[model samples]
Target: MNIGRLRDRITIQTLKQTRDITGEILETWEDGHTLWASVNMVSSKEAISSGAELAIGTVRIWIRYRKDINATSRIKVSTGPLAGRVLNIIGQPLPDAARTRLEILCREGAEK
Candidate 1:
């Protein structure tokens, strides 16, 4: 993959679940790391469900390889027009044979 195209900035986040004082489960997202990536919009579809419009989009991001990210992680775009957009990481990250970079599959517009 071309490393020069890894120009978009993004943040990686992990889910954190803990018990509250009243024995209630509380869930939150914690930032894991931030790095540059090449964000690509693979596809997008719009659906009308229960009179509500839902837009689902698939995305692929390429970034430098790192061992910390996982399928459970989420990505937050930090720059460009897509900034502030959050995406759920799908399956697992695919690392190139050289282990120099990783391709992360993700989806957007779904309820989190």
Candidate 2:
């Protein structure tokens, strides 16, 4: 992937857990990094039988590979006029095995 192709600024975050006063486990996401990436919607589908309108947007975020980002990462688009919509990273971040370009597959719904 060409590094220059990335134009949008996005925020990457990691999942964290903590115990509340009742000892109930609560999950939180901490800000990871603010970086430039090429955001693209790979495909779209509308099913009359199935409704996942809120989870309709599935996208591919392309950014330079980093050591910390992986399948556990979560991304949020915090740029432009958009209201910082978020996506959960599905599966592992796959690289070409050369450590050159990293691909983080993000989807609308399902965490894990």
Candidate 3:
């Protein structure tokens, strides 16, 4: 699914799996850089096991990045319900090594 267009110049090394919950593209930032955009409720699902609390909603946000830079300094936008409202969750960009590993895992999750 085409979420958004690339803002600046960036080299997309890999595109991670499309998350089932939100259908949002959970990709890895080969170059630790920053992108700007808002989240849109693409699609959602609800599942309940034997014992569960409340229904869960995974929102997919249309994101856009640059088109050239190979490696960025920041990745993994945020987490939790109010994550969208509060931009810049942690004050640190994920390392290059870690980002690669995460990208791999994200792909695996998509496959499964």
By TM-score, who's the top model here? 1
lDDT of 1 by residue, 1-112 (tens): 4644687887988888888887987789888678988887653432233123223456778788877788888998887447889988876777878888887877784685
Tell me the whole-model lDDT of each prediction, alpha carbons only.
0.75, 0.68, 0.28
lDDT of 3 by residue, 1-112 (tens): 4434322221123334456685777665343433443333222232143123212333222333223322223224343323423221112222334232111001111222
Clashes of each: 0, 0, 14
Candidate 1: worst 10 consecutive residues by lDDT? 46-55
Compose the digit string of candidate 2's lDDT tens values, residues 1-112: 3544677767888878888987988888988788877766554452222255223455677777776786787888776323377877865777747776677767765445
lDDT of 2: 0.68
Which scores better on TM-score, 1 or 3? 1
In candidate 3, position 92 carries an lDDT of 23
> Over 4 Å off in model 3, which ranges?
1-31, 41-56, 65-75, 78-81, 84-112
**Model 2 lDDT at residue 33:** 82
Q: Give candidates' CA RMSD values in order.
A: 6.2, 5.8, 16.1
